[PDB]
Amino acid sequence: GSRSSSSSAGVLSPSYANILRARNKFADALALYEAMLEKDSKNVEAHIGKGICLQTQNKGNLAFDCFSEAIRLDPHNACALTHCGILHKEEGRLVEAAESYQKALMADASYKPAAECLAIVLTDLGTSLKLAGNTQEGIQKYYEALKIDPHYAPAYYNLGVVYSEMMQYDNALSCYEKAALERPMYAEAYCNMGVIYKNRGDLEMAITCYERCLAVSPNFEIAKNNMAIALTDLGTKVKLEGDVTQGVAYYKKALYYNWHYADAMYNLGVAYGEMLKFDMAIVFYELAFHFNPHCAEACNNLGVLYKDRDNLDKAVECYQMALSIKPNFAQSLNNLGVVYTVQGKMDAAASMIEKAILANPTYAEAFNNLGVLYRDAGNITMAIDAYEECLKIDPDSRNAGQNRLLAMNYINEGLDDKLFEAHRDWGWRFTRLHPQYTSWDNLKDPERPITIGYISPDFFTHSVSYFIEAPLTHHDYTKYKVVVYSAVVKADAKTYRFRDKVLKKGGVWKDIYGIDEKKIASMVREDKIDILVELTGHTANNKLGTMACRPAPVQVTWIGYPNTTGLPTVDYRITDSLADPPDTKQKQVEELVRLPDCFLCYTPSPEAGPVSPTPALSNGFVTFGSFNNLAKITPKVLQVWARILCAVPNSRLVVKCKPFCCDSIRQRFLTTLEQLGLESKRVDLLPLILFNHDHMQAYSLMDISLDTFPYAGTTTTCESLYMGVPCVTMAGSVHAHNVGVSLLTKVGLGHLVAKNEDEYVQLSVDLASDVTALSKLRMSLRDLMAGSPVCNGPSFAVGLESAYRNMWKKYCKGE
Amino acid sequence: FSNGSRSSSSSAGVLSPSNDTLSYANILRARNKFADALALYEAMLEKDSKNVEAHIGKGICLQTQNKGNLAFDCFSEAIRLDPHNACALTHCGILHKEEGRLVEAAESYQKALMADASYKPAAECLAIVLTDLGTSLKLAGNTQEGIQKYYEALKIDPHYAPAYYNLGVVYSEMMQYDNALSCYEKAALERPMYAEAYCNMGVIYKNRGDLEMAITCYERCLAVSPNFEIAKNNMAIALTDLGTKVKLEGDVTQGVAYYKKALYYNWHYADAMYNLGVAYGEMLKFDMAIVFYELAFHFNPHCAEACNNLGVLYKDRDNLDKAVECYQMALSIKPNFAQSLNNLGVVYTVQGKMDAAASMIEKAILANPTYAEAFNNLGVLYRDAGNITMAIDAYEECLKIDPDSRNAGQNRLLAMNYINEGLDDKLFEAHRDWGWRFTRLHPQYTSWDNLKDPERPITIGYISPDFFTHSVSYFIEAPLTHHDYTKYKVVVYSAVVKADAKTYRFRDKVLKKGGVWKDIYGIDEKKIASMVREDKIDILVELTGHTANNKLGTMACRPAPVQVTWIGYPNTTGLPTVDYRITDSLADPPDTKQKQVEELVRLPDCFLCYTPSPEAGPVSPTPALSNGFVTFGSFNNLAKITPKVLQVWARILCAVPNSRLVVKCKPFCCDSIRQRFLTTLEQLGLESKRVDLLPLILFNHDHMQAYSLMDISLDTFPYAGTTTTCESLYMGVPCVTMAGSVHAHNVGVSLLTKVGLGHLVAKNEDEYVQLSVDLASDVTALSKLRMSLRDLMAGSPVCNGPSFAVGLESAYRNMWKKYCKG
Ligand SMILES: Nc1nc2c(ncn2[C@@H]2O[C@H](COP(=O)(O)OP(=O)(O)O)[C@@H](O)[C@H]2O)c(=O)[nH]1
């Protein structure tokens, strides 16, 4: 059997001090209680009143005495029972406290003070359980507290931290949401909600949870840092979707919450650099690296920005600090190698780039820079290899693609068509990557004044300048106007001297540096360009992408590159009947326009200096020499030069090249000559010198210059003939081989043109034979060809401008 | 004839004489092929032991192989066989210099030049060694002897730059900066890549005031050496100084540009960072300015100005805990810093720590005895604490320092209404003197292009910052909801600094009725004035008086031809540009002796219209039935509770026994001012157990409901409550007011009379006290009153806007009447 009970009702409950108490009149109300107890020692309300007063005074031992006196007079008093529990909790008797709360609620279930106090102590019992690992027994103790008081927020919040610790993030959320509903001023709940929303991949909602958290506590540092982190991550997310400025805005806000968050510094350096604001980007990077000494990315990007400023010393130091943090950081190894390539430290540059490639085996630009390095040291086969390996990785790489076509000219003697096919194959693949204009508004009238355009990056002191100063000066702007599209990366006195000249005669000058080739293409239509002539070919910083769109009705290539462009968009190429004879078996994608006499016209800088005495008179021997690229001096050229120097007794050879500062290049260049018979004390490998005056006064040490093949010199022979030193050249089957033919011949020294090796050799030693004839030839040369058609501008412009107007006349009909 | 040496006649020597191995060896030597050349030289010497050029070539080759004393042994045979070979003598002098025998080097250099005066190598090396001797003598203090050694090298080689540079160095430390400049200019002309000369030139130009010249000198220096660190730091210092100079000429933008470029040269130059925070704060870009200040204080922990300006920016964010932290570190670095002392005291004032606030502000006044705004903040402290006479004393102290201080002058006039009874005319004179001063500083518009038709459609401008949950809002809601907008189109100029739900609600209603709402927060009052003229405003009505964020400066320009003041301030404005003032026949009787600057426009019924809170709550029963005692009290400003009010209330609390007082004010959050009020009241005969000082309850609904605690409210005098008595009436709590001489003393008269309860309008103290104890006797009658007051006042003219509206717009066109007539 089971026990059951019927309940009887008791006697009907009978029909200043505490009002002062509610208004915090502790001392006055206390006195009335003390008086009340001496008038009647069994009034429980007086005992409870004094106990609350004494509890304010921190006299807890006395309060437990009188609260117990109240329960012993009148048990089932919710107030007295609840207060004895409050004392039991503050003393540390938590379970005895909850017992007193429970018998209070039995007395009066409506007495919410006991419900709230009980929920608090049960929550504390549950969180003590959680730390002891009894999590499930703790979770239950939480839910009991919520049954007693469903509005106690700490129970919801403590439920959320285990539901997150047990990785039930949805459950942890709903606990935190109701914690925030029962207490809108719960920062910790809002902050922990933001952390979950962040880790789950919605930072916008994480950020609005952090916003609500810091609205309650602006100095909640943990949430402050998490706010910066979330704001930086969302800045990066918005930046990659194309909105750079809003990403920058988020980055700066992230710094408001955390002014030393390095990740926002670095990302602001990246975004400002992309905005071309490099001066400020440098500051952000230094600040990032200051706060984060492990941010090797900031050191790298600083090195890049300082290399674009030509501060190579500081660029090295930045790369060094990057590589001291991440030794296998592929960018900094490559970037350091690029700097060393420029400084001439060839061995170190190769080591740097080789390590960059080991780090990133598909670092295509690293392979292209390696080919650049090999070509600079005059190793064309290996340079082409490094370009071909880059092209295996990126078949559309603009850099290696053009650098490979250019490199192949240094060794192509043109007995097949593989060179022309390589150019043509490149032109097809390149033109498909470029939208082409299929109609042109230009008014078709043959004898209209023509505005012709020259696009080139070489309007500074550069090889092309000496041959593009003659037209700019002696062009007739009245009926052949010129519009110069200058892509000069670093201008100099020559650029402004050109510019001010061009502007004075009535032509246009547009700086196109940093401008995409597609906008340049549409500028060409704005300027109504009739003749668009590019002067770079596949040499560095060319603008062939502009040509690939065909902005002008007619396009020509000239001066810059000794071959075809391979572009079907170009129609013409300006040569002469000697550099490209009419029987040339070399294929070229453009139609060849052969100008009267020479296709070039040299203009010498008047600060060259006078023709200096022939050294053979003061030295007792004849010195041969060349000032061409190391890349042009093939091993078959050293063979021929060694025959020449084995023919002339005690003669000497001198060559000046940039890589000759590095002695690994100089020593190996010597070794190849000593196994070739020529010993070291007869050969002088001079390093590059920086002054132009000193350069053309460095022909003082040379009696005869020897041209290169299959890539013959163009400016170097023109400069040599200007300083009195004659040049024996060799003809060939391709254009790059016969430039020396046309130059020497139209100057008047065609008898110094050789058709083969043996003639080349015999001509050179024949010329070293009579030293007095040398001395007279030296003085005759400068004025011989200053009055030739090689140095006379106005003569050239007529035939060129007549070619331009025939160009125009063909187009007009529809050729 | 005892005499000195005679003149010497010189004869010429034997004629100079009229190759291949010597030429080969010399070219090998010229191209650094030294070991090969040495072989050929040695062969020349065994063929001819006296070949002097082979001796010289051998010595040069051997010297490059670090065999020095053997090279000396070749050069010495060279000088023995040929004593007039300049080349040999110079190589001996070169060796002498390399071996530290600096005197024997100049010895052989001079000997070589005696041999050949045109031998340039001898001149060049001798110039080098002589300047080295000169700098050595300068290090040894023989300054003048060093200067002549420089000029000696300049005589032999006038193209040797280091002589010019070192001359400029000594000239600089001798403070001949013009001589130093010309020396460096020549040094740069002889050597254009002489960076140190450009750097030192910039230092002179900077120290002489010409920054713009200095930065170009540093530019030419760093174009040669981009990594010249002290030239970089000097460039940042100059750029920051020049950015500050041009920022004080008004061009803040490029002043910022100079600061940023300085950071490119020195990324941790704290001075540029702090100045960027100053400029970016002036541009209102407070978030970025915080980062600049934190970076400045990070790189310069001794920059207390960064901590000060940081605290100010976080205080305007209400992050007082962080503001305090900022101010305390600024005082960690500069304990005497007046701004941070004052600012920390401002924060303490807002928090309620009245005496820490007073001590701080006093320390600021010690640091700067003319700190006008510190005196003003002292008065604000005293006014908040309720000590009006000291608040006025603080304002008057500031006005001695700055007679045109706006905060002080307007706070002084407003504070005088709390205590002024109005027997004299000194209050009106103080207002009139302020208006004369204030109009002397605001240019007036003398022409008004507004069309002159008396019954034309006209626009009424309301300009107030109180269009938010503010006392004034409860009285301006009525004209906004009930206005014609047809011939009386209203235009609001809201200067609300922190909008809330009521502001959005007001902006909605005015736009739906057909008016315009223009937020003028932060816009200059003179720009506000011409904005009043753009919007064709015909009658400008200001609602703020001398209370906070008033726009009386706009009014002082007189942008509109007719100007009014209303609601906000219980007195005249003092401005002669304001033409009229809206009041009523009870608050301002026709027989009043209180003098104004504007013409009084008395209106029918009350001059105010109360639109009450929608969610106020219901009326609560009178608590006297539950308590057993009657409760008195007031929810008015502590400032309004003058000590004279306290004495009157004291004898009220003495007449009704076992009754209590309750007063709810913000300054009672500070327990010290709390019980200072109590001890004052105890000496007045009413001890602390019968008084209750309630801190402000920041929730509106709970504040309205707090009237449950009190049976009868007691108006203040001479400044009588305006919202509070309206509020208390709407909660059924009756309020007895006392009338007086001035308008602030008779607001409660107009309110109560026109609400329907003129029997609670006292006429003196004895009236006031006995009417209160009259209603403190019949508790049942009080139960009748509490549930009736609500519906009568809603029916009173005090709460019905449309009737109020036509009365207002009648007076409005009645002023547009006189404007056209002339
Ligand atoms: N939220 C809130 N507002 C209050 C409280 N006490 C007063 N106010 C507001 O402050 C205004 C009273 O300002 P006061 O200067 O005393 O008005 P006046 O003395 O009648 O001219 C009223 O409009 C109330 O809305 C409070 O305890 N809580």
Residue numbers in the entry:
A (entry chain B): 23 to 37, 49 to 848
B (entry chain A): 20 to 37, 44 to 847
Authors' account:
Despite the amino acid sequence is similar to human O-GlcNAc transferase, Arabidopsis SPY has been identified as a novel nucleocytoplasmic protein O-fucosyltransferase. Later studies show that SPY plays important roles in multiple developmental processes, including the circadian clock, phytohormone cytokinin signaling, plant architecture, root development, abiotic and biotic stresses.
Here, we present a crystal structure of Arabidopsis SPY/GDP complex at 2.85 Å resolution. Eleven tetratricopeptide repeats (TPRs) (residues 44–430) make up a superhelical conformation. A short C-terminal region following the catalytic domain (residues 848–914) is invisible in the structure due to less of density map. GDP is observed on the surface of C-Cat adjacent to the interface with N-Cat. During the model building of our Arabidopsis SPY/GDP complex structure, strikingly, we found that the N-terminal loop of one protomer in a symmetry-related SPY dimer B, encompassing the residues from F20* to S37*, wrapped around the concave surface of the superhelix and traverse the active site of one protomer in the SPY dimer A. More interestingly, S21* in dimer B is located close to the phosphate groups of the GDP in one active site of dimer A, strongly suggesting it is a target residue for fucosylation. A continuous asparagine ladder throughout the inner layer of the TPR superhelix, including N300 in TPR8, N333 and N334 in TPR9, N367 and N368 in TPR10, N402 in TPR11, together with N436 in the connector region recognize the backbone of the substrate loop by forming a hydrogen-bond network.
